[PDB]
Amino acid sequence: YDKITEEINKAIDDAIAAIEQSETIDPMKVPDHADKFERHVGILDFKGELAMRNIEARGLKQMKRQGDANVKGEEGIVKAHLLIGVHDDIVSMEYDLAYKLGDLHPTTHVISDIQDFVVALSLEIPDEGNITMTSFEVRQFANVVNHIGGLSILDPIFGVLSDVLTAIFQDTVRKEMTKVLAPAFKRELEK
Protein backbone atom coordinates (compact mmCIF):
# COMPACT_ATOMS: atom_id res chain seq x y z
CA TYR A 1 0.00 0.00 0.00
CA ASP A 2 2.98 2.30 0.51
CA LYS A 3 3.86 2.19 -3.20
CA ILE A 4 0.29 3.20 -4.08
CA THR A 5 0.26 6.00 -1.49
CA GLU A 6 3.64 7.33 -2.69
CA GLU A 7 2.59 7.30 -6.35
CA ILE A 8 -0.65 9.11 -5.47
CA ASN A 9 1.19 11.70 -3.38
CA LYS A 10 3.76 12.17 -6.16
CA ALA A 11 1.02 12.73 -8.74
CA ILE A 12 -0.82 15.10 -6.39
CA ASP A 13 2.28 17.17 -5.61
CA ASP A 14 3.22 17.33 -9.30
CA ALA A 15 -0.36 18.41 -9.99
CA ILE A 16 -0.26 21.05 -7.24
CA ALA A 17 3.11 22.37 -8.42
CA ALA A 18 1.82 22.74 -11.98
CA ILE A 19 -1.33 24.43 -10.61
CA GLU A 20 0.63 26.93 -8.51
CA GLN A 21 2.60 28.03 -11.60
CA SER A 22 -0.62 29.04 -13.39
CA GLU A 23 -1.53 32.73 -13.42
CA THR A 24 -5.21 31.73 -13.31
CA ILE A 25 -4.88 30.32 -9.78
CA ASP A 26 -3.21 33.25 -8.00
CA PRO A 27 -4.83 35.66 -8.54
CA MET A 28 -8.05 33.81 -9.49
CA LYS A 29 -10.80 35.84 -11.13
CA VAL A 30 -14.35 35.08 -9.98
CA PRO A 31 -17.38 35.95 -12.17
CA ASP A 32 -19.26 39.04 -11.04
CA HIS A 33 -22.33 38.40 -8.89
CA ALA A 34 -25.47 40.25 -7.87
CA ASP A 35 -28.25 39.25 -5.51
CA LYS A 36 -31.27 40.49 -3.59
CA PHE A 37 -31.40 39.91 0.14
CA GLU A 38 -33.89 40.16 2.99
CA ARG A 39 -32.71 39.92 6.60
CA HIS A 40 -34.72 40.55 9.77
CA VAL A 41 -32.58 41.51 12.77
CA GLY A 42 -34.83 42.36 15.72
CA ILE A 43 -36.98 45.36 14.86
CA LEU A 44 -34.79 46.18 11.84
CA ASP A 45 -35.84 44.59 8.53
CA PHE A 46 -33.34 45.05 5.70
CA LYS A 47 -34.60 44.52 2.14
CA GLY A 48 -31.92 45.36 -0.39
CA GLU A 49 -29.65 44.45 -3.28
CA LEU A 50 -25.92 44.05 -3.76
CA ALA A 51 -23.44 43.57 -6.60
CA MET A 52 -19.91 42.18 -6.24
CA ARG A 53 -17.55 43.09 -9.10
CA ASN A 54 -13.85 42.49 -9.83
CA ILE A 55 -13.68 39.51 -7.47
CA GLU A 56 -10.16 38.16 -6.98
CA ALA A 57 -8.89 35.29 -4.82
CA ARG A 58 -5.28 35.28 -3.53
CA GLY A 59 -3.41 32.72 -1.52
CA LEU A 60 -4.06 29.55 -3.50
CA LYS A 61 -0.38 29.29 -4.53
CA GLN A 62 0.32 27.96 -1.02
CA MET A 63 -1.84 24.88 -1.71
CA LYS A 64 -0.31 21.77 -0.15
CA ARG A 65 -1.37 18.17 0.33
CA GLN A 66 -2.66 17.62 3.86
CA GLY A 67 -2.01 14.19 5.33
CA ASP A 68 -1.20 10.90 3.66
CA ALA A 69 -3.43 9.93 0.74
CA ASN A 70 -6.40 7.86 1.87
CA VAL A 71 -5.96 4.57 -0.01
CA LYS A 72 -8.76 1.99 -0.23
CA GLY A 73 -8.76 -1.41 -1.90
CA GLU A 74 -12.21 -2.36 -3.19
CA GLU A 75 -12.97 -5.08 -5.77
CA GLY A 76 -9.45 -5.03 -7.17
CA ILE A 77 -9.69 -1.26 -7.72
CA VAL A 78 -7.69 1.41 -5.88
CA LYS A 79 -9.86 4.23 -4.52
CA ALA A 80 -8.28 7.31 -2.95
CA HIS A 81 -9.60 10.29 -0.99
CA LEU A 82 -7.37 13.34 -0.54
CA LEU A 83 -7.38 16.80 1.06
CA ILE A 84 -5.28 19.71 -0.34
CA GLY A 85 -5.11 22.81 1.84
CA VAL A 86 -3.78 26.27 2.59
CA HIS A 87 -3.07 26.29 6.31
CA ASP A 88 -0.32 28.82 7.33
CA ASP A 89 -1.87 31.21 4.81
CA ILE A 90 -5.37 32.63 4.36
CA VAL A 91 -7.23 32.80 1.09
CA SER A 92 -8.19 36.43 0.63
CA MET A 93 -10.81 37.78 -1.75
CA GLU A 94 -10.90 41.42 -2.75
CA TYR A 95 -13.84 42.89 -4.61
CA ASP A 96 -15.97 45.99 -5.12
CA LEU A 97 -19.38 45.83 -3.45
CA ALA A 98 -22.22 48.12 -4.52
CA TYR A 99 -25.21 47.71 -2.20
CA LYS A 100 -28.61 49.40 -2.06
CA LEU A 101 -30.72 49.61 1.12
CA GLY A 102 -33.52 52.16 0.79
CA ASP A 103 -32.02 55.53 -0.09
CA LEU A 104 -28.49 54.38 0.77
CA HIS A 105 -26.58 53.13 -2.30
CA PRO A 106 -22.88 53.03 -1.40
CA THR A 107 -19.98 51.45 -3.26
CA THR A 108 -17.11 50.13 -1.12
CA HIS A 109 -14.08 47.91 -1.54
CA VAL A 110 -14.33 44.73 0.55
CA ILE A 111 -11.67 42.21 1.62
CA SER A 112 -12.93 38.81 2.81
CA ASP A 113 -10.54 36.39 4.53
CA ILE A 114 -11.13 32.63 4.26
CA GLN A 115 -9.48 30.65 7.03
CA ASP A 116 -8.49 27.00 6.49
CA PHE A 117 -9.35 27.00 2.78
CA VAL A 118 -8.99 23.35 1.67
CA VAL A 119 -10.30 21.28 -1.28
CA ALA A 120 -11.30 17.58 -1.28
CA LEU A 121 -10.85 15.16 -4.19
CA SER A 122 -11.50 11.47 -4.89
CA LEU A 123 -9.53 9.35 -7.38
CA GLU A 124 -10.32 5.97 -8.94
CA ILE A 125 -7.40 3.90 -10.26
CA PRO A 126 -7.62 0.53 -12.02
CA ASP A 127 -4.82 -1.30 -10.22
CA GLU A 128 -2.93 -1.90 -13.48
CA GLY A 129 -2.77 1.68 -14.75
CA ASN A 130 -4.16 5.20 -15.17
CA ILE A 131 -5.74 7.69 -12.74
CA THR A 132 -9.36 8.90 -12.86
CA MET A 133 -10.56 11.81 -10.71
CA THR A 134 -14.14 10.92 -9.80
CA SER A 135 -14.95 13.68 -7.31
CA PHE A 136 -13.76 17.21 -6.57
CA GLU A 137 -15.18 19.96 -4.38
CA VAL A 138 -14.04 23.02 -2.47
CA ARG A 139 -14.95 22.61 1.18
CA GLN A 140 -17.46 24.70 3.05
CA PHE A 141 -15.45 27.57 4.48
CA ALA A 142 -14.89 27.35 8.23
CA ASN A 143 -14.96 31.13 8.54
CA VAL A 144 -15.24 34.05 6.12
CA VAL A 145 -14.28 37.31 7.83
CA ASN A 146 -15.46 40.38 5.91
CA HIS A 147 -13.68 43.74 6.02
CA ILE A 148 -16.07 46.29 4.52
CA GLY A 149 -14.62 49.77 4.11
CA GLY A 150 -16.56 52.69 5.53
CA LEU A 151 -18.62 50.69 8.06
CA SER A 152 -17.86 50.18 11.73
CA ILE A 153 -18.09 46.67 13.15
CA LEU A 154 -21.09 47.94 15.17
CA ASP A 155 -23.06 49.19 12.17
CA PRO A 156 -26.21 47.12 11.46
CA ILE A 157 -25.52 47.58 7.76
CA PHE A 158 -22.17 45.88 8.39
CA GLY A 159 -23.82 42.92 10.10
CA VAL A 160 -26.37 42.53 7.30
CA LEU A 161 -23.83 42.82 4.48
CA SER A 162 -21.47 40.50 6.38
CA ASP A 163 -24.14 37.80 6.70
CA VAL A 164 -25.26 38.13 3.07
CA LEU A 165 -21.69 38.07 1.72
CA THR A 166 -20.82 35.05 3.88
CA ALA A 167 -23.80 33.16 2.45
CA ILE A 168 -22.78 34.24 -1.07
CA PHE A 169 -19.29 32.86 -0.40
CA GLN A 170 -20.63 29.56 0.93
CA ASP A 171 -22.62 29.23 -2.31
CA THR A 172 -21.59 31.17 -5.43
CA VAL A 173 -17.90 31.77 -4.69
CA ARG A 174 -17.30 28.17 -3.64
CA LYS A 175 -18.93 26.81 -6.80
CA GLU A 176 -17.13 29.20 -9.15
CA MET A 177 -13.79 28.37 -7.51
CA THR A 178 -14.58 24.68 -7.98
CA LYS A 179 -15.22 25.37 -11.68
CA VAL A 180 -11.65 26.63 -12.04
CA LEU A 181 -9.89 24.15 -9.75
CA ALA A 182 -11.53 20.90 -10.93
CA PRO A 183 -10.50 20.77 -14.65
CA ALA A 184 -6.85 21.69 -14.04
CA PHE A 185 -6.51 18.99 -11.37
CA LYS A 186 -8.26 16.61 -13.78
CA ARG A 187 -5.68 17.45 -16.46
CA GLU A 188 -2.67 16.87 -14.22
CA LEU A 189 -3.99 13.71 -12.55
CA GLU A 190 -5.25 11.92 -15.67
CA LYS A 191 -2.33 12.78 -17.99
Binding site: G42, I43, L44, F46, L101, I153, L154, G159
Partner: protein
Protein backbone atom coordinates in the same frame (compact mmCIF):
# COMPACT_ATOMS: atom_id res chain seq x y z
CA UNK B 1 -8.22 58.65 30.63
CA UNK B 2 -8.12 56.07 27.84
CA UNK B 3 -11.66 55.12 28.84
CA UNK B 4 -12.85 58.70 28.26
CA UNK B 5 -11.36 58.57 24.75
CA UNK B 6 -13.07 55.19 24.33
CA UNK B 7 -16.44 56.64 25.37
CA UNK B 8 -15.99 59.57 22.96
CA UNK B 9 -15.08 57.30 20.02
CA UNK B 10 -18.01 55.02 20.83
CA UNK B 11 -20.45 57.95 20.87
CA UNK B 12 -19.09 59.10 17.49
CA UNK B 13 -19.60 55.59 16.08
CA UNK B 14 -23.18 55.63 17.41
CA UNK B 15 -23.85 59.02 15.80
CA UNK B 16 -22.74 57.63 12.44
CA UNK B 17 -24.89 54.51 12.96
CA UNK B 18 -27.99 56.67 13.59
CA UNK B 19 -27.29 58.93 10.61
CA UNK B 20 -26.94 55.95 8.26
CA UNK B 21 -30.05 54.21 9.63
CA UNK B 22 -32.13 57.33 8.97
CA UNK B 23 -31.33 56.73 5.27
CA UNK B 24 -33.17 53.37 5.36
CA UNK B 25 -35.88 53.41 8.04
CA UNK B 26 -38.19 55.85 9.80
CA UNK B 27 -37.02 57.91 12.75
CA UNK B 28 -39.16 56.00 15.26
CA UNK B 29 -37.58 52.62 14.47
CA UNK B 30 -34.11 54.18 14.14
CA UNK B 31 -34.25 55.84 17.57
CA UNK B 32 -35.79 52.77 19.24
CA UNK B 33 -33.00 50.64 17.80
CA UNK B 34 -30.43 53.15 19.08
CA UNK B 35 -31.99 52.74 22.53
CA UNK B 36 -31.78 48.93 22.30
CA UNK B 37 -28.13 49.07 21.23
CA UNK B 38 -27.21 51.46 24.07
CA UNK B 39 -28.92 49.19 26.62
CA UNK B 40 -26.91 46.21 25.31
CA UNK B 41 -23.69 48.27 25.40
CA UNK B 42 -24.27 49.32 29.01
CA UNK B 43 -25.00 45.74 30.08
CA UNK B 44 -21.80 44.50 28.40
CA UNK B 45 -19.64 47.26 29.91
CA UNK B 46 -21.11 46.76 33.39
CA UNK B 47 -20.49 43.01 33.12
CA UNK B 48 -16.85 43.52 32.09
CA UNK B 49 -16.12 46.17 34.76
CA UNK B 50 -16.68 43.57 37.50
CA UNK B 51 -14.37 41.04 35.83
CA UNK B 52 -17.33 38.74 35.20
CA UNK B 53 -17.36 35.89 32.70
CA UNK B 54 -21.15 35.51 32.81
CA UNK B 55 -22.99 36.25 29.57
CA UNK B 56 -25.59 39.01 29.73
CA UNK B 57 -29.16 38.53 28.53
CA UNK B 58 -29.42 39.78 24.93
CA UNK B 59 -32.76 40.70 23.30
CA UNK B 60 -33.66 38.79 20.12
CA UNK B 61 -31.65 39.74 17.06
CA UNK B 62 -28.82 41.49 18.93
CA UNK B 63 -26.51 38.46 19.33
CA UNK B 64 -24.48 39.53 16.28
CA UNK B 65 -24.05 42.95 17.90
CA UNK B 66 -23.13 41.28 21.19
CA UNK B 67 -20.20 39.41 19.60
CA UNK B 68 -19.16 42.35 17.41
CA UNK B 69 -19.13 44.79 20.33
CA UNK B 70 -17.14 42.31 22.44
CA UNK B 71 -14.53 42.16 19.64
CA UNK B 72 -14.63 45.96 19.23
CA UNK B 73 -14.08 46.56 22.96
CA UNK B 74 -11.25 44.02 23.13
CA UNK B 75 -9.51 45.69 20.17
CA UNK B 76 -9.81 49.03 21.93
CA UNK B 77 -8.40 47.72 25.20
CA UNK B 78 -5.42 46.44 23.23
CA UNK B 79 -5.03 49.81 21.47
Amino acid sequence: PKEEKFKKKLEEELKKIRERLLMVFDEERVEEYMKIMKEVIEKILENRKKGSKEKVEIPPGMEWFYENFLRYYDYEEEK
